[PDB]
Design a protein around this nucleic acid. Structure first.
Ligand code: MG
Ligand code: MG
Ligand code: MG
Ligand code: MG
Ligand code: MG
Ligand code: MG
Ligand code: MG
Ligand code: MG
Ligand code: MG
Ligand code: MG
Ligand code: MG
Ligand code: MG
Ligand code: MG
Ligand code: MG
Ligand code: MG
Ligand code: MG
Ligand code: MG
Ligand code: MG
Ligand code: MG
Ligand code: MG
Ligand code: MG
Ligand code: MG
Ligand code: MG
Ligand code: MG
Ligand code: MG
Ligand code: MG
Ligand code: MG
Ligand code: MG
Ligand code: MG
Ligand code: MG
Ligand code: MG
Ligand code: MG
Ligand code: MG
Ligand code: MG
Ligand code: MG
Ligand code: MG
Ligand code: MG
Ligand code: MG
Ligand code: MG
Ligand code: MG
Ligand code: MG
Ligand code: MG
Ligand code: MG
Ligand code: MG
Ligand code: MG
Ligand code: MG
Ligand code: MG
Ligand code: MG
Ligand code: MG
Ligand code: MG
Ligand code: MG
Ligand code: MG
Ligand code: MG
Ligand code: MG
Ligand code: MG
Ligand code: MG
Ligand code: MG
Ligand code: MG
Ligand code: MG
Ligand code: MG
Ligand code: MG
Ligand code: MG
Ligand code: MG
Ligand code: MG
Ligand code: MG
Ligand code: MG
Ligand code: MG
Ligand code: MG
Ligand code: MG
Ligand code: MG
Ligand code: MG
Ligand code: MG
Ligand code: MG
Ligand code: MG
Ligand code: MG
Ligand code: MG
Ligand code: MG
Ligand code: MG
Ligand code: MG
Ligand code: MG
Ligand code: MG
Ligand code: MG
Ligand code: MG
Ligand code: MG
Ligand code: MG
Ligand code: MG
Ligand code: MG
Ligand code: MG
Ligand code: MG
Ligand code: MG
Ligand code: MG
Ligand code: MG
Ligand code: MG
Ligand code: MG
Ligand code: MG
Ligand code: MG
Length: 336
RNA sequence: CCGUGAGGGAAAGCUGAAAAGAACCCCGGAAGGGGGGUGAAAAGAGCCUGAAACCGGGCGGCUACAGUGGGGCAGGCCCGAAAGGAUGCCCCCUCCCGAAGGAAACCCCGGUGACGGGGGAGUACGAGGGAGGGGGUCCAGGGUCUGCCCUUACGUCUAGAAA
RNA sequence: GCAACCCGCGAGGGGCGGGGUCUUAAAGGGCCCGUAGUCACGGCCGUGAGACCAGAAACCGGGCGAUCUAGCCCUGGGCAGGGUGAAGCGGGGCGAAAGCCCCGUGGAGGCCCGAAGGGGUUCUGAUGUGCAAAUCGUUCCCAUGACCUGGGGCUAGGGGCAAAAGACCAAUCAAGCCCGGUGAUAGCUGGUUCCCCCCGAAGCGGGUCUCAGCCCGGCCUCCCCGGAGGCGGCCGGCGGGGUAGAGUACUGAUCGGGGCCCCGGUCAAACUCCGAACCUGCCAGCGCCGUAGAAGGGGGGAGGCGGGGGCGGUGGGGUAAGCCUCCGCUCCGAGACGGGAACAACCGAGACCGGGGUUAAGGCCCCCAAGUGCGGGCUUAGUGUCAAUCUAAAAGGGCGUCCCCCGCCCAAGACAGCCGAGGCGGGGGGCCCCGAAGAUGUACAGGGACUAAGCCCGCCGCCGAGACCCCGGCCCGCGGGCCGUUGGCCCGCGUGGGGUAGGGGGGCGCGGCCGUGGGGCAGAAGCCGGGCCGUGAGGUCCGGUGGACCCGCGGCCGACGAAGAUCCCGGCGGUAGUAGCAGCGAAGAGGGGUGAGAAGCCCCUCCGCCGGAAAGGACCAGGGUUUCCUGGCAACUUCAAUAGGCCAGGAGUUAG
RNA sequence: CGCAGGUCGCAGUGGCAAGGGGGACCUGACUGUUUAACAAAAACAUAGGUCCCCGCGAGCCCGUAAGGGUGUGUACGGGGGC
RNA sequence: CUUAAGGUAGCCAAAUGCCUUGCCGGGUAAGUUCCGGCGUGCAUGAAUGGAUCAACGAGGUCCCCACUGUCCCGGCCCGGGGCCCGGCGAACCCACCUCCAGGUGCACAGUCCUGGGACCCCCGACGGGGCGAGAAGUCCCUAUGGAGCUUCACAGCAGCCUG
RNA sequence: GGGCAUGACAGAAAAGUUACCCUAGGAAUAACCGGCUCGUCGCGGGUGAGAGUCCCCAUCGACCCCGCGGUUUGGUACCCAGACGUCGUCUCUUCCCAUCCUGGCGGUGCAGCAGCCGCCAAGGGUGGGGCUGCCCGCCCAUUAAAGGGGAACGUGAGAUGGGUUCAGACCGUCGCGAGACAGGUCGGUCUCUACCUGUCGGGGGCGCUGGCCGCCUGAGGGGAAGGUGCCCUCAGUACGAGAGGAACGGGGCGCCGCGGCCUCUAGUGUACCGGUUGUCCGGCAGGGCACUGCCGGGCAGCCACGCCGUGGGGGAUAACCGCUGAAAGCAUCUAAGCGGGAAGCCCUCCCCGAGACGAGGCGGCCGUUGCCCUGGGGGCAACCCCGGGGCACGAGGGCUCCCGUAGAAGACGGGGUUGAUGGGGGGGCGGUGUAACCCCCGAGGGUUUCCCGAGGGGAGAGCCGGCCCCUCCCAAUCGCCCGAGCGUGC
């Protein structure tokens, strides 16, 4: 094998490293959470920028407990989501696949939805709800179809993004259906979904970097004593043994970035109502200003500075939950 | 024409009987193109005939869920004027003869049984060879494609070649 | 003589005898004798000649070369700047003398640093279908001298020249180049061109400066002579033999017992009292072949003189080998086809063409034609899945499980801890388990999968080749017959029909000639496509194109047939609208004019590069009109063009 | 060429231009020469040392020969080795 | 004693020591190299030159200081290639042209067997495979093949000496 | 007729050397790799003399014997001489298990701490240096441990080129000699524009049973996405005569790997600002060139030396440990049944994903139509059917346009007047460092103290932004296209 042991260069768990099929993250997994009341299990927001904050450490066993520590934070611009439709799911008896059985739309969808959808002038919502009720007894899951409101964000674009977010919180399917139907035509604000201090998972398409070489793409070494090597140094030496031929595990140049990634256990530090208190006087570089609600996340988030980011309840939460009390954010670097 | 030199050294034939060598009109910057002329024939000065490779266009067949070339059988689409048959070919029916070979239903005897034996029966049938009747329209041949079956480029030394 | 066959004569053939001659004292022996040659035409082969075609490195003859390079000679040119500081010469200081010390002056050196110039170290940099058949960048070495450089001159091939590397002597040097000897030779390598039909090998023995060659035999083929016997099989009569086994008796080896002997035991390629199977000699018979020609003999031509697989000789050797070296049958080579998953030589089996039928090996759950066929038993490990090539397994352990045999106990007081019926041990067999570990991809050995669709003992039917049977067609060998015949046709018979090298027999095509008969401007040859005929080489016809020659038949002759030779010459592709048109320290822009057309030609403005020069001034050799003017753009310039060292037309070089 | 004073920068040989230095061993004394096109060297040469053939009509070498080189020279010389 | 003598002065695990990374010191955290010693030295030694390094070195080597993108360990930037457009417009190579696995076979298959896959076409990149391309293998052997060189080979010819 | 001789004996008269080498050929024949073989090499098993205080088998294993692997070396000569690039290293990927650590279990001559031995197990780890051309090996400091093998001795059309193994040269030795040595030593060209395939990423189309939009599903595919240490407590406790000295559980944090991100810090930053050298533009100011002239600072962007995330569980199992339990009145983990049991396998988790041809589900939008020109046929009286073309209707889509969450080309995303998409203008925030003008100070000198003078101070900064906001002032225009519609059968 190798002359000297060392781990392989880069992961093959993200193979193939192709461009994401869609700029909007498509979430595969939604957790089962018992909150005691029905609620959406996720939210969507626009990444605005990064700052750093002075946060009091509230972990009693932590060596920094009670101290003020500086943490890098990510600001999300989070205008309310507009609920456009409710969809019901059952299980196909032939194979156990989850299958949509129907959906009910708001009668008068907003004009901006017409930029992406082929809609009638009016939906007859009552008939659709009536038809939906026939499938109540075979329902296993209920999701709402939400549209973003980018006009209320700092981006200012008009074309919205549309995605499904399930309703959870209680084990009873019927109450989830009743709660989802009550949301038809209404908006959902981040405070309706999350509470400050809780953990969330974040899913987004990462920043694009175009075609990149094998050194940057996989972390292969530049050939040591770089000047010695004819035909270049930013490369692998060989591209394989004699057999098997080029395998799919061989590092090769290609697209780097613009992939969908999921990161876990990011703490929500603050959910604000008015973004003027967090927007720097210069504005967020390459983004703009935040005028409505915002989410302050501890740490970094995948994606470029205008990407739509999906937050969900965690699917791998740690054994010990964070403290119930809201974290104490003393100061943020965008302030005086 | 090549080598300082001694020396070395190619390729390259054909308008038409006659120039009758293309007047004249339109277009083009021009080479030239279209129309219109000459001649038995463009044979048009890049000049007899004008093959193949090769490239363009048209036509026939195929073409994005199916692994390629060759052969046989069956079929689809297309061609099938002449030089081949059309007294053809194809289908049906009936009749006769028929090599090697050759059942079945059913009755009887045996075996646990797979099956064997006597009769039915050297029958029904059977390559092919003869005769007639009804119906149809091309048949042969060719291009290409599909299905099924078969199939390991050539030349060579070698004990041994798809190597 | 019915025939069978017997008898006589008996050319040719065979044997003797006789004769000529040589040798010898002679006998004996050698050669020769009772008839056929010679000349020609065609063919095959040998030897020479270039000798089927292509191919060396070489060697010799006579010439040509020192514009390159090596050396030397004659006559010209060049080397910024700086540093060090020899001999010699002054002054001062110390000092008793000698002398010593300091400072200066001076300007030596195959001295030092470093431009020009010369050289060529490193990056083992760039380039590596290059700018270039040796270059470029960078870093380097020398740079007043054994220094660098121009012109002229000398030394020439077995010779030169060499501060010597066998360097260099015109991109050529462990012996130049040109032409000639010369088509050098090659046991070696490559190539060697139409069809059908008949037969059909070999890699063995001997000799060889022989081992990649060749010759004489074996094996093939064709022809002729000859004339009745022959032998890959079997039975018998009469013989030969010394292997397997056996023995341990001769020659040897070797373990024990008993008193050099006796008894028991272990052995032998180079031991043998015995002794098979088996092979082999003669005779008789059988069987088959043979007068449609046995034995034997003569002549022509070979190929080949590298073999290989299976099985058998424990062959002999070797740890073993898809190993080396012998002996024998068969098969591949030179043999199609069915089965084996594939697969020259394992099994089956030998193929002219078409069709029908039946079997062989092997198979019958699906792939896949035919059985989810029949009875019994075993295995629980997916063990395994119908011989070999072919992908596997040992010593050993296991009552795991199925089974067989033996010994002992129990006569119901056995085994196990009164109860009541079987119990304990040994030996063996079947299947399976452990022993059992590998490298790209699944219980691999064809795949699916199967608890039988596995294994063992038996059984029934079916499928399945080109084999075997039958029908039709074709061809062949041999024999017979007919026909005025360098040939044609008919009949009969064949347990006739594969074939490389090679031998033998017949036909097709191409160019010409000698004859004969014809076609063609109402359309020859050629060319494109098509129909028909022939097993085939090929022939013939039709439609189109073309524009003047051509063909049938008989005979004769060749500069006579291509798919291939890193073949030759020409043309033309894919590659591909791809590489390159970057790198070496300059580059363009605006406006106007000309013009069919302008980023690029002409004019101005702006911007840049050289300036002890890849760039300004002069000029030798070499080049030879490239100079200048006018006009132009088919070609030429790595793009464009109205430009040009290009093209056309004209002109131009003045000397005491 | 020198002296005194003032003064700025991160940097005053400001760009350009322009030695890294020291210790030791092997080896050839040195400068020089070399495999044009894979070897620049410790190889060749070298000054110096030493030996040999030679008194010139010599020694050594070239030429078929006529003749020639060393030699317009002469042992403090010519030639030949190491 | 053996073909005469019998390695002297020196020098050394040497560019010369196989054994051998010899043994002991130095230097390193760690030293098969290097330096200093040691020496019956496989096989050192005197113009075949021995010992010997001042000066010199594009010679070969070890150590120290300084220094740094050599490295830890990679990042960003600049000019030209690159990529795209316009224009010009080749070559190498080429029997035909090839998805993967495990087999089989002249023993290392694109083409054979049994499997596993694949909608087709196009662009960029690379260099694992095509036993990739280049060059009738220089290695090695064979040939009753060469060339040049050597001498105690077989011969021969000059040159010199001698009658 | 006898003899004189060829012993290489079916009869030439015959020495070397080539690494300066050349030609013809040979896989008839060596060297590398491959094939066969496995003596050798490595690994496993049987046996049990003997050692182990007693005690064969905790640990060993004499004398012998049975095997496996293809990993050393050899044997052979089957393929390849019109050629498969010859050692090592670098880089990069994968596979094996006969397991060094990490997970599980057992034995011990296992008190504890350690150690030794066996079994399951290949998911992950197995590192940094010194010496030598190495490979191997020895050594140093660490470490959980610093395993071994295969892939044409993996990988030179990827590199490197130190050794080996060309031509030059030196030494020792051998040879009369030229020369030779697989003994040492110094020097000594690493060629190719990628045709096919593969791999990695990026596009166009056709299909999915009329066209389209949006949201989903999940067959299968990929994954190591995580691995592994340390400290405290337990506790100076258990154990132990002492010396010494654990563990489960609980708490905290790294190292290596993977995936993101740019707030901080660091790098860069030929946008930008300033200083300054030489020269040129007459001087000042401003500027060219010195290939950013050099130097300092530096926004955005990119980036690591920076920051963030990176888990437990469930199921069936392996080695095995047990329950009940007969065969076999007892006993027995096993024969039926049952319980427990690994970093391994599967799922959970992350990525790709309907070309998943059984081409899927859901909701919605659209089409399911007409007219014109022309050719043919039927009966001709309209008419109807068929061929070709054109136009209209029509959801949706594209080009053109302004751009950037994107980007080699394509693609993707945003905007397009019902509009803040780029620019301009104003404002915010930021870089540099304080322009011009004016006033004061200035070492000293002179037309004497109204001039020169490097420079210092004040007020004012000045220049600039590939960032944010606001504002229609300019430009997102004019336009060019694609598009289902119909039959037939099962
Ligand atoms: Mg290099
Ligand atoms: Mg013509
Ligand atoms: Mg016809
Ligand atoms: Mg007719
Ligand atoms: Mg051969
Ligand atoms: Mg062979
Ligand atoms: Mg062949
Ligand atoms: Mg001859
Ligand atoms: Mg000769
Ligand atoms: Mg001569
Ligand atoms: Mg000259
Ligand atoms: Mg000098
Ligand atoms: Mg070099
Ligand atoms: Mg180079
Ligand atoms: Mg190149
Ligand atoms: Mg100098
Ligand atoms: Mg030499
Ligand atoms: Mg010569
Ligand atoms: Mg010669
Ligand atoms: Mg010649
Ligand atoms: Mg025959
Ligand atoms: Mg041969
Ligand atoms: Mg007999
Ligand atoms: Mg015997
Ligand atoms: Mg015996
Ligand atoms: Mg015998
Ligand atoms: Mg032989
Ligand atoms: Mg044999
Ligand atoms: Mg042969
Ligand atoms: Mg077969
Ligand atoms: Mg069947
Ligand atoms: Mg055995
Ligand atoms: Mg098995
Ligand atoms: Mg025959
Ligand atoms: Mg004739
Ligand atoms: Mg041929
Ligand atoms: Mg040609
Ligand atoms: Mg071409
Ligand atoms: Mg290019
Ligand atoms: Mg310059
Ligand atoms: Mg230019
Ligand atoms: Mg200048
Ligand atoms: Mg100058
Ligand atoms: Mg000049
Ligand atoms: Mg001129
Ligand atoms: Mg002119
Ligand atoms: Mg001219
Ligand atoms: Mg400089
Ligand atoms: Mg020297
Ligand atoms: Mg050279
Ligand atoms: Mg050199
Ligand atoms: Mg010397
Ligand atoms: Mg001396
Ligand atoms: Mg001497
Ligand atoms: Mg001594
Ligand atoms: Mg010395
Ligand atoms: Mg010594
Ligand atoms: Mg040394
Ligand atoms: Mg000596
Ligand atoms: Mg010496
Ligand atoms: Mg000596
Ligand atoms: Mg000396
Ligand atoms: Mg020198
Ligand atoms: Mg182009
Ligand atoms: Mg095989
Ligand atoms: Mg191939
Ligand atoms: Mg490409
Ligand atoms: Mg050859
Ligand atoms: Mg050769
Ligand atoms: Mg010979
Ligand atoms: Mg002999
Ligand atoms: Mg190889
Ligand atoms: Mg070998
Ligand atoms: Mg062994
Ligand atoms: Mg034991
Ligand atoms: Mg081996
Ligand atoms: Mg061989
Ligand atoms: Mg081979
Ligand atoms: Mg080859
Ligand atoms: Mg290769
Ligand atoms: Mg090659
Ligand atoms: Mg194991
Ligand atoms: Mg290798
Ligand atoms: Mg290479
Ligand atoms: Mg390679
Ligand atoms: Mg080297
Ligand atoms: Mg070397
Ligand atoms: Mg060498
Ligand atoms: Mg000697
Ligand atoms: Mg390349
Ligand atoms: Mg998976
Ligand atoms: Mg990272
Ligand atoms: Mg900077
Ligand atoms: Mg100024
Ligand atoms: Mg200037
Ligand atoms: Mg500049």
């Amino acid at each position: 094998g190798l002359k000297i042991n060392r781990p392989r260069r880069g992961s093959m768990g993200v193979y193939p490293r192709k461009r994401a099929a869609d700029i909007v993250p498509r979430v595969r997994t939604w957790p089962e959470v018992n909150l005691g009341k029905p609620t959406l299990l996720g939210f969507a927001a626009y990444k605005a920028g990064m700052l750093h904050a002075v946060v009091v450490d509230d972990r009693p066993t932590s060596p920094l407990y009670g101290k003020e520590v500086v943490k890098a934070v990510t600001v999300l611009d989070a205008p309310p989501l507009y609920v456009a439709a409710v969809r019901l799911y059952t299980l196909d008896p032939t194979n156990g696949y989850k299958v949509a059985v129907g959906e009910a739309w708001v009668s008068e969808p907003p004009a901006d939805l017409r930029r992406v959808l082929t809609l009638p002038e009016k939906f007859d919502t009552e008939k659709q709800l009536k038809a939906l009720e026939e499938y109540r007894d075979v329902a296993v899951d209920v999701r709402v179809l939400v549209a973003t409101q980018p006009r209320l964000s700092g981006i200012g674009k008009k074309t919205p993004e549309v995605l499904e977010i399930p309703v959870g919180g209680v084990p009873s399917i019927d109450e989830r259906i009743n709660f989802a139907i009550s949301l038809l035509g209404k908006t959902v604000s981040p405070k309706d979904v999350f509470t400050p201090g809780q953990l969330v998972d974040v899913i987004a398409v990462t920043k694009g970097k175009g075609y990149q070489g094998v050194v940057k793409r996989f972390g292969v070494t530049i050939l040591p004593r770089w000047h010695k090597h004819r035909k270049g140094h930013r490369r692998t030496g060989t591209i394989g043994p004699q057999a098997p031929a080029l395998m799919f595990t061989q590092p090769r140049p290609g697209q780097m970035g613009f992939h969908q990634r999921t990161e876990y256990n990011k703490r929500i530090l603050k959910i604000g109502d008015n973004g003027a208190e967090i927007t720097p006087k210069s504005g967020f570089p390459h983004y703009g200003v935040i005028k409505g609600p915002y989410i302050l996340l501890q740490g970094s988030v995948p994606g470029a500075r205008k990407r739509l980011v999906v937050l969900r309840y965690p699917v791998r939460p740690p054994k010990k939950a964070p403290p119930a009390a809201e974290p104490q954010v003393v100061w943020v670097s965008s302030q005086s």
